[PDB]
Amino acid sequence: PEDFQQHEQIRRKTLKEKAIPKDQRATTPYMTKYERARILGTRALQISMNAPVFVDLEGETDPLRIAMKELAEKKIPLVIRRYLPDGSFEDWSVEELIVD
Amino acid sequence: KAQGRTSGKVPIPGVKQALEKKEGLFRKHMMGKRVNYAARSVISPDPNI
Amino acid sequence: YQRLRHMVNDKFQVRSTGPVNSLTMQPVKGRKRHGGIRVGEMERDALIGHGTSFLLQ
Amino acid sequence: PQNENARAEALNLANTDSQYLTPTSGSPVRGLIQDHISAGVWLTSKDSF
Amino acid sequence: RASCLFCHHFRLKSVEVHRYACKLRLLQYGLIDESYKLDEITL
Amino acid sequence: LSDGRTTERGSFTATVNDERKKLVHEFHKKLLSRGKCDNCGMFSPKFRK
Amino acid sequence: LVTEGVNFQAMWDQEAFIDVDGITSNDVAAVLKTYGVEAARNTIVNEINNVFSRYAISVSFRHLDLIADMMTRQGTYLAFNRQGMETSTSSFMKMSYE
Amino acid sequence: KSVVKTSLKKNELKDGATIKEKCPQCGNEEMNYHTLQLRSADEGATVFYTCTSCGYKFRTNN
Amino acid sequence: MDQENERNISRLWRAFRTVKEMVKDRGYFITQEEVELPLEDFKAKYCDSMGRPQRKMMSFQANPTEESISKFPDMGSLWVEFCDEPSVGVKTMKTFVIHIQEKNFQTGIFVYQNNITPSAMKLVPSIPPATIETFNEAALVVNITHHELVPKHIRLSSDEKRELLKRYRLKESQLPRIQRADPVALYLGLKRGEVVKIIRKSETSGRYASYRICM
Amino acid sequence: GVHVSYDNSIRDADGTLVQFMYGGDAIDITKESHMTQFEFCLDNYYALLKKYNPSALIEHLDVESALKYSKKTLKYRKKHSKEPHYKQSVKYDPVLAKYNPAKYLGSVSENFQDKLESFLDKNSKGVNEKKFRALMQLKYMRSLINPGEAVGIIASQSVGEPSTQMTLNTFNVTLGIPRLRE
Ligand SMILES: [Zn+2]
Ligand SMILES: [Zn+2]
C-alpha cells in the first residue's frame, strides 16, 4: 500500500533508464544466428501449446517447420531484447531484421 | 585436519573432504551430471545415409 | 583369421528413464543396472563453445 | 533432446553442416576419406566412357 | 595475534587502523584513486 | 554518488577486487608483527598453535 | 645473435654492433620488467606461435591475441591457476576449479 | 686438442634423406622428411616434411 | 687516455637525448634539433675544459606547446633536473623541493646517477600540486618506445575519455589496466586514471587502436 | 564466459573487458576463407552477388559515410609511412574504432583494405572496378563475428586441441608442451 509505492516507483524508473530508443539504437541490423535459434525455438514452443498460427500450414506436424514457415514471411510476433553488458538494452522486432 | 589414531585407508571423511578432488561434488555431479534419455553404442560405417 | 575375445555384444546400452539417487536425484551407473550416460567436464565446455544454451539447459 | 528450444539448436547451431570448417584456423573437417578418393580418380580419368 | 590482551585493543595505532578502515570504505565503490589520495591528505 | 560512477550498492570490479587484496594482505602483516602496544606499553607473548 | 641468459640493460652498452631497438627475448616476465605491458603482450603472441609453427600446426592469431590480452589483463603477467584467478568476480568458478 | 673432431660445422651437415614431394607453396620437388611413429598400432608413420628453398613445411598424416 | 671518459659521455649524450624525447613525447615544447643534439655538440657545449662533462648546464625548464594546453588545460612548466652528486643526500633534496616551490612548476623530473638516500625517497609525493618523477641515467640509455614491439602510446584527455566510457557504456574500471610504476607509464608520466590509447599492429588487421587505464 | 557482446567488444561475462574487437578485425574464422580470395570472387560475381543480397539491404544501413572515411586515412597513411612508429602522427583514428562494421558499409580492416586496393591495380579484366569494391566490402560485413559468440571456448579449443599432437622427439630450446606450460 505505501512501501510498494516506494518499490514500483524506483523499479520502473530504473527500467525506464536503460532503454535505448529507435533513433539511438546502433547495434547490428542483422539476425545474429542465435536470435534465429531462440526465435525458432520459442515460436515453435508456443505453437505446440495452441498459440495462434499466422500462416497457412498445409500438413505439417512439427512445430519447428511451422515456425520456419512464419519466419519466411516475417509473421513472428516477438521482440528481441538485446542486452548490453552495462545493463542497457535495445528492442528489436522480427519484422525489422533480415533473415540470412 | 584431524589427528585421530592411525591411517585408516583414506579415513572417514568430514564435509570438506566431500568437496575436494576430481570426485566429490562439483566436477563429479555438478559439472558432470549424468543424463536421462541417452545411450552409447559401437559406431559403424554406412555410406547410404 | 582369429576371432577375438572382446566383442560388441556386451558393450552397447540404452537409457531413457529410471533410478535416481538420494543425495543427487540423479541417475545410476551400471551396465547390468540401467547405466546412465555421463555428460562430463569437457562435454559441458563444448556446448558452450557451440553457443547453444538450450542444449545445455 | 527433449524440448523445442533445443531441437532448433541441434538443427541450426551445433549441426554438422555449419561445422564444416574447424574454428581453429578455418580448415575443413568434413570430407570423404579412403574409398571414394582413390575411386574418384578413375571416374574423372579420361578413359571413363 | 594483534589484539592486546591487556589494553583491550590492538597493539596498533588509532589512525593506522583508521586508514585501512577508511580506504576499504572507498574500495567498496567504483573508486580506487581516492583511496590513494586519502593517503596523501594528511598532516 | 552525484555521478553515475557508483551507487550505494557499490561497485565490484576485478580491478577493485585486485587492490582490495593489497590493503588487507598488508593489513594482515603488520598486525601480525608488533613489538609492544601503542596506546599502552603492555602486551602478550607469542601465541603458538 | 642468440644470447643464452637474459640481461637487457647491459646489452644497451653495445649498440655499435647491435640494433638495440630490435632485441627480442622470450623471458616474458623480463620483457615486462623493462619494456612494459603492451610489449610483454607482444612476446606472448610470438612465443606461443613459435611452438606451433615448429610442428607445422597453424592456429589463427585471434586466439593468441585473445589469450595474451586475457593473461595480461591486469597490467601484470598473470596465468591460469589459483593465483591468476585470485582476482575474479564469480566464486563458483573458483570453487569448481581446485 | 682431441685427435678426433669434436664440433660440427655451421653449414656442413646436409641431410640427404630427400624424397620428391610436390610442394604446393613454391613448386619445389626435392624436400626432406622427418617421419615418426605417434599413435598405437592402428596407425603408421605420420609423415612430416621440411623444404630448403621456400622454408615452409608440408604434412601427410598417414 | 680518454677511454673511460668517452662512453661515460656517450651514454650521457644518449641519456640527455631520451629525456628531450621524453619531454617532447608528452607534448611539451622541446624543439626538433634540441632532441637531435650530436655528441660533438654535446661535448662542445655542456662539457667544460677539463675533458669531462658537467650536468648543471643540462638542467632546464620545459613548457607546454600550443596544443598541449588546448587539449590538457591543467598543464604548466616542467623542470628537468640532473644532478652532480652520485649519492643523493636528503639535505640536498631540500634545494630540489624549494626550487619547485619557488619557481612554482608543475612537475620536476629529477634524474640521478647511482642512488638516492632511502630517507630521501619519502619527499617525492611531499608536494600535493607538484609530484616528483625520478629516473636513473642507466634507466634512460635507450628510449624504450622505439622498439618494434612497443606500440604507439597516446594519452587522452578527460573529454574523449568521457566519450570513451560512453561509447561502450563502461564502468570506470572495466578496462585492461596498466601498472602504477610501469616504465612506459613512467615515461609518459601518468597519474592514476589517465587512460592511454595504444595503437598496436594486430597481425590480421594492421593498425588497431586499443586502450588501457592507469591505477 | 568470454564472449563477443553486441557492441563487438570482447567482454568477460562479469562486465570486464579484454579486447575491443575480436582480435582487431573481428572476423569469423569459419567465414574468412574466400574473404581475401580476390581472384575467385571476381570469377563468380553473378552467383555470389545474389547471396550477399543488396537489393533488399541498403535501406537498413549506412553506405557512403565510411567509404569516404576509409579513403582519407589510407591517403593519410601513405604520407606517414617511412616514419618509425614512435614518430607517427596519430591524428586519424582507424575506421574500425569509430565505425561499427555491422552497421557501416566499407568500414573494414586496414590490412585487408590494403590488399583489396592493391589487387585491382594489377588487372586487365563485364564487371567494373567500382561494383567490385562494394561486393568485397559487403562480404566483410556479412562475414563478421556474430555477437554472443563463444570466443573463450574456441580460444582454448584451438590450443588444447592441436597440442595433442606435439610431444614427440626433437627435429637448446624448451619445446612443445613443457614450453607451453611456462
Ligand atoms: Zn594498549
Ligand atoms: Zn617449397
From Swiss-Prot, chain B:
Top-level taxon: Eukaryota
Membrane-spanning segments: none
Annotated compartments: Nucleus, Nucleolus
Remarks, miscellaneous: Present with 2840 molecules/cell in log phase SD medium.
The family this protein is said to belong to: Belongs to the RNA polymerase beta' chain family.
Quaternary structure (record): Component of the RNA polymerase I (Pol I) complex consisting of 14 subunits: RPA135, RPA190, RPC40, RPA14, RPB5, RPO26, RPA43, RPB8, RPA12, RPB10, RPC19, RPC10, RPA49 and RPA34. The complex is composed of a horseshoe-shaped core containing ten subunits (RPA135, RPA190, RPB5, RPO26, RPB8, RPB10, RPC10, RPA12, RPC19 and RPC40) where RPA135 and RPA190 form the DNA-binding cleft. Outside of the core, RPA14 and RPA43 form the stalk that mediates interactions with transcription initiation factors and newly synthesized RNA.
Function: DNA-dependent RNA polymerases catalyze the transcription of DNA into RNA using the four ribonucleoside triphosphates as substrates. Component of RNA polymerase I (Pol I) which synthesizes ribosomal RNA precursors. Besides, RNA polymerase I has intrinsic RNA cleavage activity. RPA190 and RPA135 both contribute to the polymerase catalytic activity and together form the Pol I active center. In addition, subunit RPA12 contributes a catalytic zinc ribbon that is required for RNA cleavage by Pol I.
Name of this chain's protein: DNA-directed RNA polymerase I subunit RPA190
Full protein: residues contained: 442 to 490 of 1664
Swiss-Prot record, chain C:
Record's subunit section: Component of the RNA polymerase I (Pol I) complex consisting of 14 subunits: RPA135, RPA190, RPC40, RPA14, RPB5, RPO26, RPA43, RPB8, RPA12, RPB10, RPC19, RPC10, RPA49 and RPA34. The complex is composed of a horseshoe-shaped core containing ten subunits (RPA135, RPA190, RPB5, RPO26, RPB8, RPB10, RPC10, RPA12, RPC19 and RPC40) where RPA135 and RPA190 form the DNA-binding cleft. Outside of the core, RPA14 and RPA43 form the stalk that mediates interactions with transcription initiation factors and newly synthesized RNA.
Shown residues in whole-protein numbering: 1033 to 1089 of 1203
Homology family: Belongs to the RNA polymerase beta chain family.
Miscellaneous section: Three distinct zinc-containing RNA polymerases are found in eukaryotic nuclei: polymerase I for the ribosomal RNA precursor, polymerase II for the mRNA precursor, and polymerase III for 5S and tRNA genes.
Protein known as: DNA-directed RNA polymerase I subunit RPA135
Lineage of source species: Eukaryota, Fungi, Dikarya, Ascomycota, Saccharomycotina
Subcellular location: Nucleus, Nucleolus
Species of origin: Saccharomyces cerevisiae (strain ATCC 204508 / S288c)
Swiss-Prot record, chain E:
Annotated localization: Nucleus, Nucleolus
Binding of Zn(2+) 2, residues: 4, 7
Family: Belongs to the RNA polymerase beta' chain family.
Protein's job: DNA-dependent RNA polymerases catalyze the transcription of DNA into RNA using the four ribonucleoside triphosphates as substrates. Component of RNA polymerase I (Pol I) which synthesizes ribosomal RNA precursors. Besides, RNA polymerase I has intrinsic RNA cleavage activity. RPA190 and RPA135 both contribute to the polymerase catalytic activity and together form the Pol I active center. In addition, subunit RPA12 contributes a catalytic zinc ribbon that is required for RNA cleavage by Pol I.
General remark: Present with 2840 molecules/cell in log phase SD medium.
Subunit note: Component of the RNA polymerase I (Pol I) complex consisting of 14 subunits: RPA135, RPA190, RPC40, RPA14, RPB5, RPO26, RPA43, RPB8, RPA12, RPB10, RPC19, RPC10, RPA49 and RPA34. The complex is composed of a horseshoe-shaped core containing ten subunits (RPA135, RPA190, RPB5, RPO26, RPB8, RPB10, RPC10, RPA12, RPC19 and RPC40) where RPA135 and RPA190 form the DNA-binding cleft. Outside of the core, RPA14 and RPA43 form the stalk that mediates interactions with transcription initiation factors and newly synthesized RNA.
Annotated protein name in UniProt: DNA-directed RNA polymerase I subunit RPA190
Source organism of the structure: Saccharomyces cerevisiae (strain ATCC 204508 / S288c)
From Swiss-Prot, chain I:
Transmembrane spans: none
Molecular-function GO terms, alphabetical: DNA binding; DNA-directed RNA polymerase activity
GO BP terms: nucleolar large rRNA transcription by RNA polymerase I; ribosome biogenesis; RNA-templated transcription; termination of RNA polymerase I transcription; termination of RNA polymerase III transcription; transcription by RNA polymerase I; transcription by RNA polymerase II; transcription by RNA polymerase III
InterPro entries: Arch_Rpo5/euc_Rpb5 (IPR014381), RNA_pol_Rpb5_N (IPR005571), RNA_pol_Rpb5_N_sf (IPR036710), RNA_pol_subH/Rpb5_C (IPR000783), RNA_pol_subH/Rpb5_CS (IPR020608), RPB5-like_sf (IPR035913)
One GO CC annotation: RNA polymerase I complex
Localization (cell): Nucleus
Keywords: DNA-binding, DNA-directed RNA polymerase, Nucleus, Ribosome biogenesis, Transcription
SUPFAM superfamilies, A to Z: Eukaryotic RPB5 N-terminal domain (SSF53036), RPB5-like RNA polymerase subunit (SSF55287)
Keyword Flavoprotein found: no
PROSITE patterns per the UniProt record, alphabetical: RNA_POL_H_23KD (PS01110)
Family statement drawn from the similarity comment of this UniProt entry: Belongs to the archaeal Rpo5/eukaryotic RPB5 RNA polymerase subunit family.
Protein name per UniProt: DNA-directed RNA polymerases I, II, and III subunit RPABC1
Gene that encodes it: RPB5
